[PDB]
């Protein structure tokens, strides 16, 4: 109706009403956040002068969801500056909006002014809850989860705010073990949260489902009973997950849980397609991990090393050990299953600049064991898919490995037993080595015999010429 | 009057949509039909 | 079994709520105002 | 050419790459191939078709 | 089940002397150097410039004569808005890391540009193309 009512306004070239099309902005937020802002611009290219504080503030968040942000800024500056026509009564409610909204962009930009903003609008109007919120997130962050008693004396003033509730979830389940807290306690006040405020919230769903999957995941698995037990608390957190999707069908998180339960259960197919799905919905470390793990249980270890390297320049900017420590392992297992020697220089190579970076004992018994299968590897080829170079590099590796696994078993508390160590040395030092120097000479008098084929067969040529 | 003058562009069940929605609702139908109906 | 260390740990962690900015009510999203604009002679 | 090994049958397309380089007969048959193919191309550069036509 | 997923961004979409058919450049977001080019029907999936497609490539469709699907039975096109057959007329083994792939949808063509390690399981006969967005 309100597009035929513009239509015929054209048609008969009488001024467009632009409540029409605030309306259809509103109805629009919904639907399609472009047509609406354009709509919006439309109505206040109408006005003119006579724009509004309402529609300024509307044109602002546009943009900022458009991630426009000098726009925003622009639409946010006008706002303030309209601000001051603004009649007495609703003057100060609306500054106070309008100075949320600017300490949001903030945020965005430079905690700094945003804090400022927030300390203004606390001692303007202690009342509001966001700022709180926002306010006592980014002290935790500053100070690293320090500021639990500010967090349990906001969940003390808003007891029935769900946002409150959220961020104090939130907050106990990044900081429970910093802080020692009960690991129940997150689950009591979540489930005092459904019973008694509201049952259809799927933040604390989420949240005890994943609580009864970590308490399921650390569970002992002894006999049929444990077993049973364990797939309990798995059917508790996929109730929860269904009251979710139930709730909303649209919620990657239940979706990611239920593919996590199905890993664990070892239904990789379904999985792999919930995470391929997600990763269509959204984009995030998370989900490549997932992925990447997904593809090692399904054995496709060319997809996993891709997805761990997208993960890494994405996100952790070479920076994050744990996704090196992935890409080597995924490199190891293709040149393990697919007998590729540039698997395994690649996967020493990454576990070296890990180590590098890190210079773990862990790490060490990995790059052990990496040089330990090379040479293994190396020596059952034969001696037409090998040379000498990669024979030389291989022994000098060996030497290393032996050097550090004596390092490791010299140390107080290595990953493996010390005697699993010095075991493998000497079983490797007495049989291994002298393997690979056979191999060499084999190698050296192979290729002398090339030589003199080559050398021998000139000569004849030259003699027939 | 700010609560009344409040409005929020996304919903708290709605906010994983965003501008892009998609419907997960044969993932759940296998999920009940495969965990809870699981024998 | 003596082979390479890696742990296997799914993220499936909860974001902090993001608290965007609040979009203002127009005028006629009013149920007062409504009537009087409509009520137009 | 079954000395030099940078010009010589790639590896990957026989299965015998390996007892190949260093013969001698068989850099025969190879040398009377050629010899073949350039008496070939110069009859027909030189007698048959004298102006490069070569769509017959 | 499938053998190649990616990203895409429309560069081009080049309509030319056709009413019906388009050619769209793409790249991958994730993996540089991997390009796109495709012939796809503007009537029932119709692409504009910058959008991001889902493009996947699949021997099969599970889970010799065509017949209309059924209702009951259910595949992986359900979860994709576009979907072609074609053959693949020619696999090029080209420099160190650039593999061509080209394959005919009844005459519309592709072109999957890319590194051996992504493209290697697509030496088939033919192939299922699944686009979603």
């Not at chain 1, 008693?149 to 409150?164: K, M, N, T």
């Not at chain 3, 740990?9 to 900015?21: S, T, V």
């Not at chain 5, 769209?24 to 504009?48: C, H, Q, R, W, Y």
């Not at chain 5, 061509?100 to 697509?122: D, I, R």
Request: charged letters at 30%; a neutral charge; proline letters at 3%.
């Amino acid at each position: 109706f309100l597009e035929k009512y513009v239509a015929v306004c054209q048609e008969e070239n009488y001024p467009i009403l632009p409540e029409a099309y605030l309306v259809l902005s509103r109805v629009y937020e919904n639907k399609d956040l472009n047509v609406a802002l354009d709509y919006l611009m439309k109505a206040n290219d109408i006005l003119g002068d006579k724009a509004n504080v309402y529609v300024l503030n509307n044109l602002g968040i546009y943009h900022f969801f458009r991630n426009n942000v000098s726009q925003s800024s622009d639409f946010f500056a006008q706002s303030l500056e309209a601000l001051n026509n603004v009649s007495p009564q609703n003057k100060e409610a609306l500054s106070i909006t309008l100075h949320y909204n600017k300490a949001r962009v903030e945020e965005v930009s430079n905690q700094s002014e945003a804090e400022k903003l927030y300390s203004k609008l606390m001692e303007k109007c202690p009342g509001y809850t966001s700022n709180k919120i926002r306010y006592i997130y980014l002290l935790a962050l500053k100070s690293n989860g320090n500021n639990y008693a500010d967090v349990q004396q906001l969940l003390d003033d808003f007891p029935s705010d769900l946002e409150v509730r959220s961020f104090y979830g939130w907050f106990l389940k990044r900081y429970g073990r910093k802080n020692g807290l009960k690991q129940d306690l997150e689950s009591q006040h979540h489930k005092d949260t459904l019973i008694n405020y509201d049952k259809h919230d799927c933040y604390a769903l989420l949240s005890l489902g994943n609580i009864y999957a970590t308490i399921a995941r650390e569970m002992k698995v002894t006999d049929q009973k444990q077993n049973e037990i364990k797939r309990q608390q798995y059917l508790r957190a996929a109730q929860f997950y269904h009251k979710v999707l139930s709730i909303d069908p649209k919620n990657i998180y239940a979706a990611q849980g239920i593919a996590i339960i199905f890993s664990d259960k070892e239904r990789t197919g379904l999985a792999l397609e919930i995470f391929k799905k997600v990763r269509d919905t959204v984009q995030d470390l998370g989900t490549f991990i997932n992925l990447g793990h997904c593809f090692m249980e399904a054995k496709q270890f060319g997809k996993a090393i891709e997805s761990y390297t997208i993960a890494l320049e994405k996100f952790s900017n070479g920076m994050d050990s744990k996704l090196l420590v992935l890409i080597g392992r995924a490199w190891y297992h293709r040149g393990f299953y697919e007998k590729s020697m540039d698997a395994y220089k690649k996967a020493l190579e990454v576990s070296e600049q890990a180590y590098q970076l890190s210079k773990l004992p862990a790490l060490r018994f990995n790059i052990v064991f990496i040089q330990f299968q090379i040479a293994d590897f190396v020596k059952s080829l034969p001696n037409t898919q090998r040379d000498l170079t990669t024979l030389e590099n291989a022994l000098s590796g060996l030497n290393d490995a032996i050097k550090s696994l004596l390092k490791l078993a010299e140390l107080e508390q290595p990953p493996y037993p010390s005697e699993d160590l010095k075991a493998r040395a000497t079983m490797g030092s007495n049989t291994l080595r002298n393997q690979l120097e056979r191999a060499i000479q084999d190698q050296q008098d192979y290729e002398m015999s090339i030589q003199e084929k080559l050398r021998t067969a000139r000569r004849k040529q030259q003699l027939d010429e | 009057e700010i609560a009344s003058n409040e409005r929020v562009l996304i919903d708290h069940n709605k906010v994983l949509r965003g501008l892009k929605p998609k419907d997960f609702s044969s993932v759940a139908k296998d999920c009940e039909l495969r965990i809870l109906k699981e024998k | 079994r003596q082979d390479y260390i890696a742990k296997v740990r799914y993220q499936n962690d909860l974001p902090a709520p993001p608290c965007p900015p609040k979009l203002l009510k127009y005028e006629i999203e009013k149920e007062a105002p409504q009537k009087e604009f409509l009520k137009d002679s | 050419d079954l000395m030099d090994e940078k010009n010589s049958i790639k590896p990957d397309v026989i299965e015998y790459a390996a007892d190949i380089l260093g013969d001698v007969e068989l850099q025969k048959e190879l040398n009377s191939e050629y010899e073949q193919l350039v008496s070939d191309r110069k009859f027909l550069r030189e007698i048959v078709f004298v102006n490069g036509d070569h769509n017959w | 089940s499938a053998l190649f997923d990616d990203i895409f961004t429309v560069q081009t979409v080049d309509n030319g002397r056709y009413n019906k058919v388009s050619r769209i450049i793409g790249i991958s977001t994730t993996n540089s150097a991997i390009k796109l080019t495709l012939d796809i029907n503007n009537e029932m999936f119709p692409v504009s410039q910058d959008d991001s497609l889902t493009v996947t490539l699949a021997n099969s469709l599970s889970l010799k004569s065509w017949r209309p699907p059924k209702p009951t039975d259910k595949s992986l096109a359900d979860d994709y808005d576009y979907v072609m057959f074609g053959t693949v007329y020619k696999f090029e083994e080209g420099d160190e890391d650039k593999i061509k792939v080209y394959v005919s949808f009844g005459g519309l063509l592709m072109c999957l540009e890319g590194g051996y390690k992504s493209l290697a399981s697509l030496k088939q006969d033919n192939l299922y193309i699944l686009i979603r967005r």
